[PDB]
mmCIF file of all heavy atoms in Angstrom:
data_model
loop_
_atom_site.group_PDB
_atom_site.id
_atom_site.type_symbol
_atom_site.label_atom_id
_atom_site.label_comp_id
_atom_site.label_asym_id
_atom_site.label_seq_id
_atom_site.Cartn_x
_atom_site.Cartn_y
_atom_site.Cartn_z
ATOM 1 N N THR A 2 23.936 0.049 9.245
ATOM 2 C CA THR A 2 22.619 0.144 9.887
ATOM 3 C C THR A 2 22.329 1.586 10.316
ATOM 4 O O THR A 2 23.227 2.298 10.762
ATOM 5 C CB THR A 2 22.551 -0.806 11.107
ATOM 6 O OG1 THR A 2 22.539 -2.163 10.652
ATOM 7 C CG2 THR A 2 21.303 -0.574 11.960
ATOM 8 N N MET A 3 21.074 2.007 10.178
ATOM 9 C CA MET A 3 20.634 3.320 10.646
ATOM 10 C C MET A 3 19.304 3.174 11.383
ATOM 11 O O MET A 3 18.312 2.750 10.785
ATOM 12 C CB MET A 3 20.489 4.287 9.463
ATOM 13 C CG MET A 3 20.121 5.716 9.844
ATOM 14 S SD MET A 3 21.424 6.559 10.762
ATOM 15 C CE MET A 3 20.501 7.149 12.173
ATOM 16 N N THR A 4 19.291 3.546 12.667
ATOM 17 C CA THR A 4 18.109 3.425 13.524
ATOM 18 C C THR A 4 17.591 4.803 13.948
ATOM 19 O O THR A 4 18.356 5.636 14.431
ATOM 20 C CB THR A 4 18.419 2.575 14.771
ATOM 21 O OG1 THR A 4 18.841 1.269 14.360
ATOM 22 C CG2 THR A 4 17.183 2.438 15.678
ATOM 23 N N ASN A 5 16.291 5.023 13.750
ATOM 24 C CA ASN A 5 15.595 6.235 14.176
ATOM 25 C C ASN A 5 14.483 5.896 15.168
ATOM 26 O O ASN A 5 13.753 4.920 14.975
ATOM 27 C CB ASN A 5 14.987 6.950 12.970
ATOM 28 C CG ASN A 5 16.015 7.728 12.174
ATOM 29 O OD1 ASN A 5 16.487 8.780 12.612
ATOM 30 N ND2 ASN A 5 16.367 7.218 10.999
ATOM 31 N N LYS A 6 14.349 6.722 16.205
ATOM 32 C CA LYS A 6 13.329 6.556 17.240
ATOM 33 C C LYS A 6 12.471 7.800 17.309
ATOM 34 O O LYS A 6 13.006 8.899 17.432
ATOM 35 C CB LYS A 6 13.979 6.337 18.597
ATOM 36 C CG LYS A 6 14.761 5.045 18.708
ATOM 37 C CD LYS A 6 15.092 4.729 20.160
ATOM 38 C CE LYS A 6 15.043 3.240 20.425
ATOM 39 N NZ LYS A 6 13.647 2.721 20.464
ATOM 40 N N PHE A 7 11.148 7.630 17.236
ATOM 41 C CA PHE A 7 10.225 8.765 17.225
ATOM 42 C C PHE A 7 8.839 8.432 17.765
ATOM 43 O O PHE A 7 8.444 7.272 17.837
ATOM 44 C CB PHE A 7 10.123 9.378 15.813
ATOM 45 C CG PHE A 7 9.528 8.460 14.771
ATOM 46 C CD1 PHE A 7 8.149 8.437 14.545
ATOM 47 C CD2 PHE A 7 10.344 7.634 13.997
ATOM 48 C CE1 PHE A 7 7.599 7.598 13.581
ATOM 49 C CE2 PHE A 7 9.797 6.794 13.029
ATOM 50 C CZ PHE A 7 8.424 6.777 12.822
ATOM 51 N N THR A 8 8.119 9.484 18.144
ATOM 52 C CA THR A 8 6.761 9.393 18.659
ATOM 53 C C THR A 8 5.871 10.242 17.760
ATOM 54 O O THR A 8 6.274 11.325 17.339
ATOM 55 C CB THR A 8 6.691 9.924 20.104
ATOM 56 O OG1 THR A 8 7.598 9.180 20.929
ATOM 57 C CG2 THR A 8 5.284 9.810 20.671
ATOM 58 N N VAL A 9 4.668 9.750 17.474
ATOM 59 C CA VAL A 9 3.719 10.458 16.609
ATOM 60 C C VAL A 9 3.214 11.725 17.314
ATOM 61 O O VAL A 9 2.701 11.655 18.436
ATOM 62 C CB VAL A 9 2.536 9.546 16.196
ATOM 63 C CG1 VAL A 9 1.439 10.337 15.490
ATOM 64 C CG2 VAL A 9 3.035 8.412 15.303
ATOM 65 N N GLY A 10 3.375 12.872 16.648
ATOM 66 C CA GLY A 10 2.971 14.176 17.188
ATOM 67 C C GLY A 10 4.008 14.911 18.030
ATOM 68 O O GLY A 10 3.697 15.961 18.595
ATOM 69 N N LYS A 11 5.230 14.377 18.116
ATOM 70 C CA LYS A 11 6.315 14.992 18.888
ATOM 71 C C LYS A 11 7.554 15.141 18.009
ATOM 72 O O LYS A 11 7.953 14.187 17.330
ATOM 73 C CB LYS A 11 6.645 14.137 20.113
ATOM 74 N N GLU A 12 8.159 16.331 18.026
ATOM 75 C CA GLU A 12 9.309 16.619 17.168
ATOM 76 C C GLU A 12 10.509 15.747 17.532
ATOM 77 O O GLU A 12 10.741 15.455 18.705
ATOM 78 C CB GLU A 12 9.696 18.108 17.216
ATOM 79 C CG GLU A 12 10.960 18.452 16.418
ATOM 80 C CD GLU A 12 11.059 19.909 15.986
ATOM 81 O OE1 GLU A 12 10.397 20.779 16.598
ATOM 82 O OE2 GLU A 12 11.814 20.187 15.025
ATOM 83 N N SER A 13 11.248 15.331 16.507
ATOM 84 C CA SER A 13 12.479 14.567 16.670
ATOM 85 C C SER A 13 13.445 14.887 15.524
ATOM 86 O O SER A 13 13.149 15.730 14.674
ATOM 87 C CB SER A 13 12.159 13.066 16.727
ATOM 88 O OG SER A 13 11.408 12.655 15.598
ATOM 89 N N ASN A 14 14.603 14.228 15.528
ATOM 90 C CA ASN A 14 15.608 14.369 14.483
ATOM 91 C C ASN A 14 15.739 13.058 13.723
ATOM 92 O O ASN A 14 16.244 12.072 14.267
ATOM 93 C CB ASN A 14 16.955 14.761 15.094
ATOM 94 N N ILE A 15 15.262 13.045 12.479
ATOM 95 C CA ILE A 15 15.410 11.891 11.594
ATOM 96 C C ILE A 15 16.763 11.966 10.889
ATOM 97 O O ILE A 15 17.104 13.005 10.321
ATOM 98 C CB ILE A 15 14.297 11.841 10.533
ATOM 99 N N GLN A 16 17.526 10.875 10.947
ATOM 100 C CA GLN A 16 18.786 10.728 10.206
ATOM 101 C C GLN A 16 18.594 9.744 9.052
ATOM 102 O O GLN A 16 18.047 8.654 9.243
ATOM 103 C CB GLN A 16 19.916 10.228 11.119
ATOM 104 C CG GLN A 16 20.937 11.275 11.534
ATOM 105 C CD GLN A 16 22.133 10.661 12.244
ATOM 106 O OE1 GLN A 16 23.219 10.549 11.674
ATOM 107 N NE2 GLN A 16 21.933 10.238 13.486
ATOM 108 N N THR A 17 19.060 10.129 7.864
ATOM 109 C CA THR A 17 19.041 9.247 6.693
ATOM 110 C C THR A 17 20.180 8.225 6.788
ATOM 111 O O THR A 17 21.026 8.318 7.684
ATOM 112 C CB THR A 17 19.157 10.054 5.381
ATOM 113 O OG1 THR A 17 20.343 10.857 5.407
ATOM 114 C CG2 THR A 17 17.944 10.959 5.206
ATOM 115 N N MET A 18 20.194 7.253 5.875
ATOM 116 C CA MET A 18 21.235 6.210 5.858
ATOM 117 C C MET A 18 22.654 6.767 5.698
ATOM 118 O O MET A 18 23.592 6.260 6.318
ATOM 119 C CB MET A 18 20.974 5.179 4.751
ATOM 120 C CG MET A 18 19.820 4.224 5.023
ATOM 121 S SD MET A 18 20.242 2.522 4.599
ATOM 122 C CE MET A 18 21.331 2.121 5.966
ATOM 123 N N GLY A 19 22.804 7.797 4.866
ATOM 124 C CA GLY A 19 24.101 8.438 4.638
ATOM 125 C C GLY A 19 24.643 9.259 5.800
ATOM 126 O O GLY A 19 25.862 9.397 5.937
ATOM 127 N N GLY A 20 23.748 9.800 6.632
ATOM 128 C CA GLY A 20 24.120 10.666 7.762
ATOM 129 C C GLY A 20 23.423 12.021 7.864
ATOM 130 O O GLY A 20 23.708 12.777 8.794
ATOM 131 N N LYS A 21 22.520 12.341 6.932
ATOM 132 C CA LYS A 21 21.830 13.637 6.923
ATOM 133 C C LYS A 21 20.722 13.698 7.976
ATOM 134 O O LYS A 21 19.691 13.041 7.828
ATOM 135 C CB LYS A 21 21.236 13.926 5.539
ATOM 136 N N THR A 22 20.949 14.490 9.027
ATOM 137 C CA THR A 22 19.953 14.719 10.089
ATOM 138 C C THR A 22 19.038 15.901 9.736
ATOM 139 O O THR A 22 19.470 16.835 9.060
ATOM 140 C CB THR A 22 20.611 14.923 11.486
ATOM 141 O OG1 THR A 22 19.594 15.031 12.494
ATOM 142 C CG2 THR A 22 21.521 16.165 11.549
ATOM 143 N N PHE A 23 17.781 15.847 10.182
ATOM 144 C CA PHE A 23 16.834 16.959 9.991
ATOM 145 C C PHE A 23 15.683 16.951 11.006
ATOM 146 O O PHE A 23 15.176 15.887 11.372
ATOM 147 C CB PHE A 23 16.288 16.982 8.552
ATOM 148 C CG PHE A 23 15.502 15.754 8.164
ATOM 149 C CD1 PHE A 23 14.108 15.753 8.223
ATOM 150 C CD2 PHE A 23 16.151 14.606 7.712
ATOM 151 C CE1 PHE A 23 13.380 14.627 7.855
ATOM 152 C CE2 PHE A 23 15.428 13.477 7.343
ATOM 153 C CZ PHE A 23 14.041 13.488 7.414
ATOM 154 N N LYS A 24 15.277 18.144 11.444
ATOM 155 C CA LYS A 24 14.213 18.304 12.437
ATOM 156 C C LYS A 24 12.845 18.152 11.788
ATOM 157 O O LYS A 24 12.571 18.771 10.758
ATOM 158 C CB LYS A 24 14.306 19.674 13.111
ATOM 159 N N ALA A 25 11.988 17.334 12.396
ATOM 160 C CA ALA A 25 10.663 17.040 11.846
ATOM 161 C C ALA A 25 9.728 16.449 12.900
ATOM 162 O O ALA A 25 10.179 15.942 13.927
ATOM 163 C CB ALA A 25 10.794 16.086 10.668
ATOM 164 N N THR A 26 8.425 16.517 12.623
ATOM 165 C CA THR A 26 7.387 15.946 13.483
ATOM 166 C C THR A 26 6.531 14.972 12.664
ATOM 167 O O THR A 26 5.884 15.382 11.695
ATOM 168 C CB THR A 26 6.493 17.056 14.080
ATOM 169 O OG1 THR A 26 7.312 18.044 14.721
ATOM 170 C CG2 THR A 26 5.509 16.482 15.100
ATOM 171 N N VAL A 27 6.525 13.695 13.059
ATOM 172 C CA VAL A 27 5.794 12.652 12.325
ATOM 173 C C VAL A 27 4.310 12.675 12.711
ATOM 174 O O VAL A 27 3.975 12.662 13.899
ATOM 175 C CB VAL A 27 6.373 11.235 12.569
ATOM 176 C CG1 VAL A 27 5.632 10.198 11.724
ATOM 177 C CG2 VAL A 27 7.867 11.195 12.261
ATOM 178 N N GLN A 28 3.435 12.689 11.704
ATOM 179 C CA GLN A 28 1.984 12.768 11.903
ATOM 180 C C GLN A 28 1.273 11.534 11.346
ATOM 181 O O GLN A 28 1.689 10.983 10.329
ATOM 182 C CB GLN A 28 1.436 14.025 11.219
ATOM 183 C CG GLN A 28 1.931 15.339 11.811
ATOM 184 C CD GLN A 28 1.477 15.562 13.248
ATOM 185 O OE1 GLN A 28 0.495 14.973 13.709
ATOM 186 N NE2 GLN A 28 2.197 16.417 13.965
ATOM 187 N N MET A 29 0.204 11.114 12.024
ATOM 188 C CA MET A 29 -0.680 10.050 11.537
ATOM 189 C C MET A 29 -1.781 10.689 10.702
ATOM 190 O O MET A 29 -2.500 11.557 11.197
ATOM 191 C CB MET A 29 -1.300 9.260 12.697
ATOM 192 C CG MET A 29 -0.451 8.095 13.187
ATOM 193 S SD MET A 29 -0.738 6.570 12.268
ATOM 194 C CE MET A 29 0.379 5.450 13.109
ATOM 195 N N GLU A 30 -1.901 10.259 9.445
ATOM 196 C CA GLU A 30 -2.945 10.738 8.534
ATOM 197 C C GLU A 30 -3.515 9.583 7.699
ATOM 198 O O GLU A 30 -2.943 9.197 6.677
ATOM 199 C CB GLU A 30 -2.400 11.862 7.637
ATOM 200 C CG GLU A 30 -2.568 13.260 8.224
ATOM 201 C CD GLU A 30 -1.638 14.290 7.601
ATOM 202 O OE1 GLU A 30 -0.492 14.426 8.086
ATOM 203 O OE2 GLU A 30 -2.060 14.976 6.642
ATOM 204 N N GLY A 31 -4.630 9.026 8.172
ATOM 205 C CA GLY A 31 -5.403 8.021 7.435
ATOM 206 C C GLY A 31 -4.689 6.712 7.132
ATOM 207 O O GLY A 31 -4.896 6.131 6.064
ATOM 208 N N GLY A 32 -3.858 6.249 8.067
ATOM 209 C CA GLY A 32 -3.045 5.042 7.873
ATOM 210 C C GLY A 32 -1.588 5.301 7.527
ATOM 211 O O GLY A 32 -0.748 4.424 7.715
ATOM 212 N N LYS A 33 -1.288 6.494 7.018
ATOM 213 C CA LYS A 33 0.085 6.886 6.709
ATOM 214 C C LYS A 33 0.749 7.545 7.908
ATOM 215 O O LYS A 33 0.087 8.240 8.678
ATOM 216 C CB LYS A 33 0.114 7.892 5.558
ATOM 217 C CG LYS A 33 -0.451 7.399 4.242
ATOM 218 C CD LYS A 33 -0.349 8.502 3.202
ATOM 219 C CE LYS A 33 -0.813 8.049 1.830
ATOM 220 N NZ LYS A 33 -0.853 9.207 0.894
ATOM 221 N N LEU A 34 2.051 7.311 8.062
ATOM 222 C CA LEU A 34 2.922 8.230 8.794
ATOM 223 C C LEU A 34 3.320 9.300 7.788
ATOM 224 O O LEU A 34 3.558 8.979 6.627
ATOM 225 C CB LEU A 34 4.175 7.530 9.311
ATOM 226 C CG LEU A 34 3.970 6.421 10.338
ATOM 227 C CD1 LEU A 34 5.283 5.685 10.572
ATOM 228 C CD2 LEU A 34 3.428 6.985 11.642
#
């Protein structure tokens, strides 16, 4: 299992299933994250 927690418009660290972490900011654009 891999769980990620984030808020739209605020930077966080997304981890992939394998373990690769990366800094990013999730944005709302027309129905898409």
Side-chain angles (χ1 to χ4, degrees), residues 2-10 12-13 16-20 22-23 25-34:
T2 290
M3 184 67 232
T4 301
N5 282 287
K6 294 194 144 286
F7 64 90
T8 302
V9 171
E12 176 157 21
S13 55
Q16 255 189 105
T17 56
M18 287 224 74
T22 185
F23 62 98
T26 307
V27 183
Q28 295 296 339
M29 273 273 181
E30 270 160 273
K33 299 180 176 173
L34 296 171

